[PDB]
Write a protein that binds this ligand. Structure first.
Ligand SMILES: CC(=O)N[C@H]1[C@H](O[C@H]2[C@@H](O)[C@@H](CO)O[C@@H](O[C@H]3[C@H](O)[C@@H](O)[C@H](O)O[C@@H]3CO)[C@@H]2O)O[C@H](CO)[C@@H](O)[C@@H]1O[C@@H]1O[C@H](CO)[C@H](O)[C@H](O)[C@H]1O
Length: 278
Protein backbone atom coordinates (compact mmCIF):
# COMPACT_ATOMS: atom_id res chain seq x y z
CA UNK A 1 0.00 0.00 0.00
CA UNK A 2 0.94 3.67 0.39
CA UNK A 3 -1.99 6.10 0.64
CA UNK A 4 -5.77 5.70 0.38
CA UNK A 5 -6.50 8.62 -1.95
CA UNK A 6 -7.65 7.99 -5.53
CA UNK A 7 -8.19 4.65 -7.29
CA UNK A 8 -7.43 2.26 -4.41
CA UNK A 9 -6.61 -1.30 -5.50
CA UNK A 10 -8.22 -3.66 -6.21
CA UNK A 11 -9.60 -1.17 -8.73
CA UNK A 12 -12.70 -2.01 -10.77
CA UNK A 13 -14.67 0.16 -13.17
CA UNK A 14 -17.80 -0.67 -15.15
CA UNK A 15 -17.61 1.15 -18.48
CA UNK A 16 -20.41 3.56 -19.42
CA UNK A 17 -20.40 2.12 -22.93
CA UNK A 18 -18.41 -0.73 -24.52
CA UNK A 19 -14.76 -0.18 -25.45
CA UNK A 20 -14.59 0.91 -29.10
CA UNK A 21 -11.98 1.17 -31.86
CA UNK A 22 -10.19 4.50 -31.49
CA UNK A 23 -10.49 4.72 -27.70
CA UNK A 24 -7.54 4.61 -25.29
CA UNK A 25 -7.30 3.46 -21.66
CA UNK A 26 -4.48 5.24 -19.85
CA UNK A 27 -3.11 3.79 -16.60
CA UNK A 28 -0.41 5.58 -14.59
CA UNK A 29 0.98 4.56 -11.21
CA UNK A 30 3.82 4.11 -8.73
CA UNK A 31 5.56 0.91 -7.65
CA UNK A 32 7.77 0.12 -4.66
CA UNK A 33 11.23 -1.40 -4.32
CA UNK A 34 9.47 -4.56 -3.17
CA UNK A 35 6.67 -4.56 -5.76
CA UNK A 36 6.55 -7.97 -7.44
CA UNK A 37 3.75 -7.64 -10.00
CA UNK A 38 0.47 -5.99 -10.94
CA UNK A 39 -2.24 -6.58 -13.53
CA UNK A 40 -4.46 -4.63 -15.90
CA UNK A 41 -7.54 -6.44 -17.17
CA UNK A 42 -10.22 -5.66 -19.72
CA UNK A 43 -13.04 -7.75 -18.24
CA UNK A 44 -16.37 -9.22 -19.27
CA UNK A 45 -19.31 -9.48 -16.87
CA UNK A 46 -22.63 -7.95 -15.79
CA UNK A 47 -22.04 -5.64 -12.82
CA UNK A 48 -20.04 -7.41 -10.10
CA UNK A 49 -20.02 -11.07 -11.17
CA UNK A 50 -16.61 -11.13 -12.89
CA UNK A 51 -14.71 -14.33 -13.59
CA UNK A 52 -16.19 -14.51 -17.07
CA UNK A 53 -14.18 -13.59 -20.17
CA UNK A 54 -10.99 -11.52 -20.10
CA UNK A 55 -10.42 -10.35 -23.72
CA UNK A 56 -7.10 -8.83 -22.65
CA UNK A 57 -5.09 -9.70 -19.53
CA UNK A 58 -1.88 -7.76 -18.94
CA UNK A 59 0.64 -8.89 -16.32
CA UNK A 60 3.65 -6.73 -15.52
CA UNK A 61 6.16 -8.90 -13.72
CA UNK A 62 9.15 -7.49 -11.87
CA UNK A 63 10.40 -10.93 -10.87
CA UNK A 64 10.31 -12.29 -14.43
CA UNK A 65 11.17 -8.90 -15.88
CA UNK A 66 8.43 -9.23 -18.49
CA UNK A 67 5.02 -7.86 -19.51
CA UNK A 68 2.78 -10.82 -20.32
CA UNK A 69 -0.44 -10.70 -22.37
CA UNK A 70 -3.16 -13.35 -22.68
CA UNK A 71 -6.87 -13.99 -23.03
CA UNK A 72 -9.24 -16.00 -20.87
CA UNK A 73 -12.45 -17.26 -22.48
CA UNK A 74 -14.78 -20.25 -22.24
CA UNK A 75 -13.13 -21.22 -18.96
CA UNK A 76 -9.58 -21.38 -20.27
CA UNK A 77 -6.44 -19.37 -20.92
CA UNK A 78 -4.73 -19.13 -24.28
CA UNK A 79 -1.00 -19.00 -25.01
CA UNK A 80 0.83 -16.12 -23.35
CA UNK A 81 2.72 -13.55 -25.45
CA UNK A 82 5.64 -11.68 -23.86
CA UNK A 83 7.64 -8.48 -24.15
CA UNK A 84 10.43 -7.22 -21.90
CA UNK A 85 9.46 -5.19 -18.83
CA UNK A 86 11.44 -1.93 -19.03
CA UNK A 87 10.60 -1.03 -15.44
CA UNK A 88 12.68 -1.83 -12.36
CA UNK A 89 11.04 -2.20 -8.94
CA UNK A 90 10.23 1.36 -7.99
CA UNK A 91 9.81 4.23 -10.46
CA UNK A 92 6.50 5.07 -12.14
CA UNK A 93 4.66 3.16 -14.85
CA UNK A 94 2.65 4.49 -17.79
CA UNK A 95 0.71 1.93 -19.79
CA UNK A 96 -1.81 2.88 -22.47
CA UNK A 97 -4.12 0.52 -24.34
CA UNK A 98 -5.72 1.72 -27.59
CA UNK A 99 -8.42 -0.43 -29.20
CA UNK A 100 -8.59 -0.82 -33.00
CA UNK A 101 -10.81 -3.11 -35.08
CA UNK A 102 -8.30 -5.95 -35.32
CA UNK A 103 -6.04 -5.52 -32.28
CA UNK A 104 -5.16 -3.60 -29.10
CA UNK A 105 -2.05 -1.43 -29.33
CA UNK A 106 -0.20 -1.19 -26.04
CA UNK A 107 2.37 1.50 -25.31
CA UNK A 108 4.74 1.67 -22.33
CA UNK A 109 6.07 5.13 -21.48
CA UNK A 110 4.28 6.29 -24.64
CA UNK A 111 6.31 3.91 -26.80
CA UNK A 112 4.45 1.26 -28.78
CA UNK A 113 5.64 -2.14 -27.52
CA UNK A 114 2.88 -4.58 -28.39
CA UNK A 115 0.15 -5.30 -30.91
CA UNK A 116 -2.24 -7.92 -29.51
CA UNK A 117 -4.71 -9.24 -32.09
CA UNK A 118 -8.26 -9.74 -30.83
CA UNK A 119 -8.92 -13.35 -29.87
CA UNK A 120 -12.48 -12.71 -28.66
CA UNK A 121 -14.95 -9.86 -29.30
CA UNK A 122 -13.72 -6.42 -28.24
CA UNK A 123 -17.39 -5.69 -27.60
CA UNK A 124 -17.38 -8.20 -24.75
CA UNK A 125 -15.19 -5.83 -22.72
CA UNK A 126 -17.57 -4.25 -20.18
CA UNK A 127 -15.24 -3.56 -17.27
CA UNK A 128 -11.56 -2.99 -16.61
CA UNK A 129 -9.63 -3.60 -13.42
CA UNK A 130 -6.17 -2.94 -12.00
CA UNK A 131 -4.71 -4.84 -9.04
CA UNK A 132 -1.40 -5.80 -7.48
CA UNK A 133 1.75 -4.01 -6.34
CA UNK A 134 0.93 -0.60 -7.75
CA UNK A 135 -0.35 2.74 -6.47
CA UNK A 136 -2.60 4.14 -9.20
CA UNK A 137 -2.20 7.87 -9.78
CA UNK A 138 -4.19 8.37 -13.01
CA UNK A 139 -6.79 6.47 -15.00
CA UNK A 140 -8.68 7.70 -18.04
CA UNK A 141 -10.54 6.06 -20.91
CA UNK A 142 -11.81 7.96 -23.92
CA UNK A 143 -10.76 9.58 -27.16
CA UNK A 144 -11.61 8.38 -30.66
CA UNK A 145 -10.15 8.48 -34.15
CA UNK A 146 -9.63 12.22 -34.49
CA UNK A 147 -9.33 13.19 -38.17
CA UNK A 148 -6.41 15.53 -38.93
CA UNK A 149 -6.55 18.33 -40.08
CA UNK A 150 -8.91 18.77 -37.15
CA UNK A 151 -11.14 21.68 -36.17
CA UNK A 152 -13.81 22.25 -33.55
CA UNK A 153 -15.23 24.81 -31.18
CA UNK A 154 -14.41 24.77 -27.47
CA UNK A 155 -17.34 24.47 -25.06
CA UNK A 156 -19.31 27.64 -24.47
CA UNK A 157 -16.77 29.26 -22.19
CA UNK A 158 -13.88 27.78 -24.14
CA UNK A 159 -10.30 27.82 -22.90
CA UNK A 160 -10.16 30.55 -20.26
CA UNK A 161 -7.72 31.39 -17.46
CA UNK A 162 -8.03 28.68 -14.83
CA UNK A 163 -8.74 26.07 -17.49
CA UNK A 164 -6.51 23.84 -19.60
CA UNK A 165 -6.83 22.03 -22.90
CA UNK A 166 -5.34 18.54 -22.79
CA UNK A 167 -4.26 16.98 -26.06
CA UNK A 168 -2.80 13.50 -26.41
CA UNK A 169 -1.01 12.98 -29.70
CA UNK A 170 1.80 11.10 -31.38
CA UNK A 171 4.04 12.91 -33.86
CA UNK A 172 4.25 10.86 -37.07
CA UNK A 173 7.34 8.65 -37.38
CA UNK A 174 8.39 10.33 -40.63
CA UNK A 175 6.73 13.63 -39.83
CA UNK A 176 8.43 16.97 -40.33
CA UNK A 177 6.06 19.16 -38.32
CA UNK A 178 2.55 19.75 -37.02
CA UNK A 179 0.69 22.54 -35.24
CA UNK A 180 -2.08 23.33 -32.81
CA UNK A 181 -4.02 26.57 -32.96
CA UNK A 182 -6.01 28.09 -30.12
CA UNK A 183 -8.32 30.60 -31.79
CA UNK A 184 -10.68 33.50 -31.15
CA UNK A 185 -14.11 33.98 -32.75
CA UNK A 186 -12.74 36.21 -35.53
CA UNK A 187 -10.08 33.78 -36.68
CA UNK A 188 -7.14 35.34 -34.85
CA UNK A 189 -4.85 32.74 -33.31
CA UNK A 190 -4.17 33.47 -29.65
CA UNK A 191 -1.58 30.71 -29.62
CA UNK A 192 0.08 28.84 -32.47
CA UNK A 193 2.02 25.82 -31.08
CA UNK A 194 4.22 24.49 -33.90
CA UNK A 195 6.82 21.71 -33.30
CA UNK A 196 9.41 21.53 -36.09
CA UNK A 197 11.61 18.44 -35.88
CA UNK A 198 13.57 19.69 -38.88
CA UNK A 199 14.60 22.88 -37.08
CA UNK A 200 14.73 21.09 -33.72
CA UNK A 201 12.46 23.61 -32.01
CA UNK A 202 8.85 24.43 -31.19
CA UNK A 203 7.72 27.74 -32.64
CA UNK A 204 5.09 29.70 -30.71
CA UNK A 205 3.37 32.71 -32.27
CA UNK A 206 0.08 34.59 -32.63
CA UNK A 207 -1.93 35.48 -35.74
CA UNK A 208 -3.61 38.86 -35.31
CA UNK A 209 -5.55 40.46 -38.15
CA UNK A 210 -3.93 38.09 -40.61
CA UNK A 211 -0.43 38.96 -39.41
CA UNK A 212 2.04 36.65 -37.67
CA UNK A 213 3.83 38.06 -34.65
CA UNK A 214 7.37 37.94 -33.27
CA UNK A 215 7.84 34.15 -32.87
CA UNK A 216 9.17 32.46 -29.76
CA UNK A 217 11.38 29.39 -30.00
CA UNK A 218 14.06 28.26 -27.51
CA UNK A 219 13.36 25.11 -25.51
CA UNK A 220 15.14 22.08 -27.04
CA UNK A 221 11.92 20.31 -28.06
CA UNK A 222 11.03 17.43 -25.73
CA UNK A 223 8.98 15.72 -28.46
CA UNK A 224 10.13 12.74 -30.54
CA UNK A 225 8.81 11.25 -33.78
CA UNK A 226 6.70 8.16 -33.17
CA UNK A 227 6.51 8.70 -29.41
CA UNK A 228 3.26 9.59 -27.64
CA UNK A 229 3.03 12.92 -25.83
CA UNK A 230 0.77 14.69 -23.36
CA UNK A 231 0.28 18.35 -24.19
CA UNK A 232 -1.36 20.69 -21.71
CA UNK A 233 -2.21 24.26 -22.55
CA UNK A 234 -2.72 25.73 -19.10
CA UNK A 235 -4.34 29.14 -19.57
CA UNK A 236 -3.42 31.59 -16.83
CA UNK A 237 -3.87 35.27 -16.02
CA UNK A 238 -0.70 36.48 -17.71
CA UNK A 239 0.41 33.64 -19.94
CA UNK A 240 -0.15 30.19 -21.33
CA UNK A 241 1.84 27.63 -19.35
CA UNK A 242 2.71 24.98 -21.96
CA UNK A 243 3.29 21.58 -20.38
CA UNK A 244 4.78 18.69 -22.32
CA UNK A 245 4.73 15.24 -20.71
CA UNK A 246 4.28 16.68 -17.23
CA UNK A 247 7.11 19.23 -17.48
CA UNK A 248 6.69 22.96 -18.18
CA UNK A 249 8.15 23.38 -21.65
CA UNK A 250 7.39 27.07 -22.01
CA UNK A 251 5.42 30.14 -20.97
CA UNK A 252 3.74 32.35 -23.56
CA UNK A 253 2.67 35.86 -22.59
CA UNK A 254 -0.84 36.60 -23.84
CA UNK A 255 -0.86 38.82 -26.92
CA UNK A 256 -4.62 38.68 -27.22
CA UNK A 257 -7.07 39.08 -24.38
CA UNK A 258 -7.51 35.67 -22.78
CA UNK A 259 -11.11 34.54 -22.40
CA UNK A 260 -13.26 33.66 -25.40
CA UNK A 261 -10.67 31.25 -26.81
CA UNK A 262 -13.44 29.26 -28.50
CA UNK A 263 -11.66 27.54 -31.37
CA UNK A 264 -9.22 24.69 -31.91
CA UNK A 265 -7.35 23.57 -35.02
CA UNK A 266 -4.81 20.76 -35.29
CA UNK A 267 -2.84 20.09 -38.46
CA UNK A 268 0.39 18.70 -39.88
CA UNK A 269 2.24 15.41 -39.46
CA UNK A 270 0.54 14.15 -36.29
CA UNK A 271 -1.95 11.62 -34.96
CA UNK A 272 -4.41 12.81 -32.31
CA UNK A 273 -5.79 10.27 -29.85
CA UNK A 274 -7.31 12.41 -27.11
CA UNK A 275 -8.72 15.88 -26.53
CA UNK A 276 -10.14 17.15 -23.24
CA UNK A 277 -10.89 20.42 -21.47
CA UNK A 278 -10.10 20.32 -17.73
C1 LIG B 1 6.74 35.49 -42.06
C2 LIG B 1 7.58 34.25 -42.23
O1 LIG B 1 7.84 33.83 -43.36
N1 LIG B 1 8.00 33.67 -41.10
C3 LIG B 1 8.82 32.46 -41.15
C4 LIG B 1 10.30 32.78 -40.92
O2 LIG B 1 10.73 33.69 -41.93
C5 LIG B 1 11.76 34.58 -41.56
C6 LIG B 1 13.17 34.07 -41.89
O3 LIG B 1 13.16 33.56 -43.20
C7 LIG B 1 14.20 35.20 -41.74
C8 LIG B 1 15.65 34.80 -42.04
O4 LIG B 1 16.53 35.91 -41.88
O5 LIG B 1 13.90 36.30 -42.60
C9 LIG B 1 12.64 36.86 -42.27
O6 LIG B 1 12.34 37.94 -43.16
C10 LIG B 1 13.25 39.00 -43.00
C11 LIG B 1 13.74 39.43 -44.39
O7 LIG B 1 14.59 38.47 -44.98
C12 LIG B 1 14.50 40.76 -44.39
O8 LIG B 1 14.69 41.17 -45.73
C13 LIG B 1 13.67 41.81 -43.66
O9 LIG B 1 14.45 42.97 -43.50
O10 LIG B 1 13.37 41.31 -42.37
C14 LIG B 1 12.51 40.19 -42.35
C15 LIG B 1 12.15 39.90 -40.90
O11 LIG B 1 13.33 39.73 -40.14
C16 LIG B 1 11.50 35.86 -42.36
O12 LIG B 1 10.29 36.44 -41.87
O13 LIG B 1 11.05 31.57 -40.96
C17 LIG B 1 10.72 30.69 -39.91
C18 LIG B 1 11.70 29.50 -39.93
O14 LIG B 1 11.52 28.74 -41.12
C19 LIG B 1 9.27 30.24 -40.08
O15 LIG B 1 8.91 29.39 -39.02
C20 LIG B 1 8.32 31.44 -40.14
O16 LIG B 1 7.04 31.02 -40.56
C21 LIG B 1 6.09 31.03 -39.48
O17 LIG B 1 6.27 29.94 -38.59
C22 LIG B 1 5.32 29.84 -37.54
C23 LIG B 1 5.69 28.70 -36.61
O18 LIG B 1 6.96 28.93 -36.04
C24 LIG B 1 3.93 29.64 -38.15
O19 LIG B 1 3.90 28.41 -38.85
C25 LIG B 1 3.59 30.79 -39.10
O20 LIG B 1 2.38 30.52 -39.78
C26 LIG B 1 4.70 31.04 -40.13
O21 LIG B 1 4.50 32.27 -40.78
Amino acid sequence: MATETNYPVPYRSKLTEPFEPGQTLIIKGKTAEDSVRFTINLHNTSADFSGNDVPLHISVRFDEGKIVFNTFSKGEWGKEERKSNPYKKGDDIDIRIRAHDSKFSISVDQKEVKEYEHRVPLSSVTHFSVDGDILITYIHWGGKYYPVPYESGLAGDGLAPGKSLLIFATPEKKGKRFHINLLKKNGDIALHFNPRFDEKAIVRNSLISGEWGNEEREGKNPLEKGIGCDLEFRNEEYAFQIYVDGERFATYAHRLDPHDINGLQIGGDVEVTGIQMV
